[PDB]
């Protein structure tokens, strides 16, 4: 039995993963979260209690309540948004509320590395999507155990992979 | 500040989900204790006071979504601090919305 909490900027992809992971369903339309609990099972069999949270400052006062007795925190970001790489706020929040718990860095929307319109918009700001090895470096620099990434839209398999590794780490 | 109506439940323990409770009108500037008290005045309307539970033995739980559940309290790790002073947590602090289910659970 493991309790995981997902945090990170609004629209970064946290609920999309949990829904794919636990509900067999990709939510293509953005509906902002307040707080929610999913239950998944990943083969020892491990029962995951997964706590989804708002990435909004508006809910800064309730989201920290989700950290209590957690096994790990999944600090999430959007790979197509090298501005969601705020992970500064996020890591300081996790440390202030939750200093005993380990931290995993999770990159989301990896499918967008080959999305032309994303690449065109990024390149007009002289930017590029976060790469895998950049994600490994950021993990190290934020003092996270490991970097993991997937795409909830194009690879359910990758999302299952993220959580099976998170499971192994909390146990 | 602003008025809210909560779906107030008595619950056996902290946990996931909601059920039909009683509408309870509160203010968003009410502390978690004041809202608990207001909820109990409704959940035990007509019942003599020596037959009601001591409110100090009950926690307030905000149930949100399908299975989200969090204990709210007048003071916790989220409370505002300035010097030696702390602000008591209100419904507005947590952003509990109108129509929210709030359960009273054994403490
Ligand atoms: N291309 C792509 N888009 C994705 C992916 N995952 C999510 N999205 C898009 O991003 C939107 C927002 O994701 P969501 O998971 O809802 O965001 P969130 O991080 O949970 N936000 P909040 O904290 O505000 O509740 C989704 O509705 C979907 O359209 C992905 O893997 N690839
Ligand atoms: Ca869908
Ligand atoms: Mg969400």
UniProtKB/Swiss-Prot annotation, chain A:
Its main location: membrane. Keywords: Cell membrane, Cytoplasm, Cytoskeleton, GTP-binding, Lipoprotein, Membrane, Methylation, Nucleotide-binding, Prenylation. GTP binds at residues 11-16, 26-33, 52-56, 108-111, 152-153. Mostly expressed in brain and liver. One of its GO terms (molecular function) is protein kinase binding. One of its GO terms (biological process) is signal transduction. The keyword Cytoplasm applies. One of its GO terms (cellular component) is intracellular membrane-bounded organelle. A motif (Effector region) lies at residues 30-38. It is found in: Cell membrane; Cytoplasm, Cytoskeleton. It comes from the Eukaryota. It is a lipid-anchor. Binds GRB7 and PLXNB1. Interacts with UBXD5. Interacts with PLXNA2. Belongs to the small GTPase superfamily. Rho family. Lacks intrinsic GTPase activity. Has a low affinity for GDP, and constitutively binds GTP. Controls rearrangements of the actin cytoskeleton. Induces the Rac-dependent neuritic process formation in part by disruption of the cortical actin filaments. Causes the formation of many neuritic processes from the cell body with disruption of the cortical actin filaments. This is Rho-related GTP-binding protein Rho6. It comes from Homo sapiens. The lineage of its organism: Eukaryota, Metazoa, Chordata, Craniata, Vertebrata.
From Swiss-Prot, chain B:
Monomer, and heterodimer with PLXNB2 after proteolytic processing. Binds RAC1 that has been activated by GTP binding. Interaction with SEMA4D promotes binding of cytoplasmic ligands. Interacts with PLXNA1. Interacts with ARHGEF11 and ARHGEF12. Interacts with ERBB2. Interacts with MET. Interacts with MST1R. Interacts with RRAS. Interacts with RHOD. Interacts with RND1. Interacts with NRP1 and NRP2. It comes from Homo sapiens. Receptor for SEMA4D. Plays a role in GABAergic synapse development. Mediates SEMA4A- and SEMA4D-dependent inhibitory synapse development. Plays a role in RHOA activation and subsequent changes of the actin cytoskeleton. Plays a role in axon guidance, invasive growth and cell migration. Phosphorylated on tyrosine residues by ERBB2 and MET upon SEMA4D binding. The record marks 70 as: Important for interaction with RAC1 and RND1. The gene is PLXNB1. This is Plexin-B1. Belongs to the plexin family. Highly expressed in fetal kidney, and at slightly lower levels in fetal brain, lung and liver.
